[PDB]
Each structure stands twice: as structure tokens, then as C-alpha cells.
RNA sequence: AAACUUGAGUGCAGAAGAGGAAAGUGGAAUUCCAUGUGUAGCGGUGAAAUGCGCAGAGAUAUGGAGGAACACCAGUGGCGAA
């Protein structure tokens, strides 16, 4: 019932609508999340700052309770709460080893979606 | 009718180019599908809801399938009759 795993990847998706952060071993197996939604923000308050570190502070709690000490940061999304959920996750007492950018970028692919008229 | 070389071509020696046609080879990303971890939302908006998820979604890790387009370079830069 209770993992023993010292070193972890905290991976922070952090969009316009919201923020959600996954924290995983180093081989990707997942031991916590929550996010902005999880925890009752709604709308405009899902994307807040103080939204995506109270998902971050949740998240490292109770991946803590599995014995997780030290984090290496995986940050992917343009939003607001990307510096947030990073400082959250060193007051939770994990210490983010180091810090990498993971957002996606094509090389000329996909067509996107229509502009928004209005 | 006879000359001439300045126009226009040809030769010779150089120069740059997303000019065109046909094969082949890449890497990023999107979608879908398959499993592992995991959990109560995700997604979306001015705000919502429809939708998707609890028959395990989203997220994260790995693998596979397929199509389309080629980040950076990249510039009143280049090439072309358009």
C-alpha cells in the first residue's frame, strides 16, 4: 500500500483553462495529481496563480506520503501558474533538482484550428 | 546592290538561385489504437453548456498505425512570363 520512491519527475501542464500537475517516478509511473478543477476553482479561477500552487501543494503532499524527497520539474503550456506550481512543490519540502520546458512544437505539421472572430 | 558592328544572337571563361518534373530518405507534431502507473474530473467560455470520464477519462510512460505539412535557417532575401 505505501510505495518507497526517493527521486521523482513532477510534470506541470499549465494551459489558459487550467492547471494540472502529475507527479510520476522517473520511469513515468504516476503517484499523485490534482489540479485547479480537482480542487473546487472554477472558470477564471482555474487558471489563476494561487489555483495551479494549491494543485501543486496537493499533488506534493500526498506524493510525499509515497517517501518522494527530491523532484525534477517538467513544465509543458503558456499559462499563468507555471512559476506557482514550481515554487509550491519546494514549499511542500520536495526539491526540484532541475527544471526543463516540454512544450510541444511542430516542425511545419498540422493545420491549426479557425482564428476566433470575436 | 555592297559594306559595318554598336542592336540581337553564338562561342569562350565564370556566378547565384524555394525555377520545373520524377523517384527516394528524414525529424518534429497531431489523431487513433495497445498496454503500465494512476484518479474524479477533463474540456470549453465573457459566463456556460453540449461533449468526454468514472465500463478508469484527462494526465504520465512506452509501443504501434496512418496521413498531411516541413520549426530554426528566413531577409522590402532568392528564382520564375504570370
Do not use: Y
Given at each position: 500500500?505505501?510505495?518507497?520512491?526517493?527521486?521523482?519527475?513532477?510534470?506541470?501542464?499549465?494551459?489558459?483553462?487550467?492547471?494540472?500537475v502529475?507527479?510520476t517516478?522517473?520511469?513515468?509511473?504516476?503517484?499523485?495529481?490534482?489540479?485547479?478543477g480537482?480542487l473546487?476553482?472554477?472558470?477564471?479561477?482555474k487558471?489563476?496563480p494561487?489555483?495551479?500552487?494549491?494543485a501543486?501543494?496537493?499533488?506534493?503532499?500526498?506524493?510525499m506520503?509515497?517517501?518522494?524527497?527530491?523532484?525534477?520539474?517538467?513544465?509543458?503550456?503558456?499559462?499563468?501558474?507555471?512559476?506557482?506550481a514550481?515554487?509550491?512543490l519546494?514549499?511542500?519540502?520536495?526539491?526540484?533538482?532541475?527544471?526543463?520546458?516540454?512544450?510541444?512544437?511542430?516542425?511545419?505539421?498540422?493545420r491549426?484550428?479557425?482564428?476566433?472572430?470575436?
Amino acid at each position: 500500500v505505501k510505495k518507497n520512491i526517493e527521486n521523482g519527475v513532477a510534470h506541470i501542464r499549465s494551459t489558459f483553462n487550467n492547471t494540472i500537475v502529475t507527479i510520476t517516478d522517473e520511469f513515468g509511473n504516476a503517484l499523485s495529481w490534482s489540479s485547479a478543477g480537482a480542487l473546487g476553482f472554477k472558470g477564471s479561477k482555474k487558471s489563476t496563480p494561487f489555483a495551479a500552487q494549491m494543485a501543486s501543494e496537493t499533488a506534493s503532499k500526498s506524493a510525499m506520503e509515497h517517501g518522494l524527497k527530491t523532484v525534477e520539474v517538467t513544465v509543458k503550456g503558456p499559462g499563468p501558474g507555471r512559476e506557482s506550481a514550481i515554487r509550491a512543490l519546494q514549499s511542500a519540502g520536495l526539491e526540484v533538482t532541475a527544471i526543463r520546458d516540454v512544450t510541444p512544437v511542430p516542425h511545419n505539421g498540422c493545420r491549426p484550428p479557425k482564428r476566433r472572430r470575436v
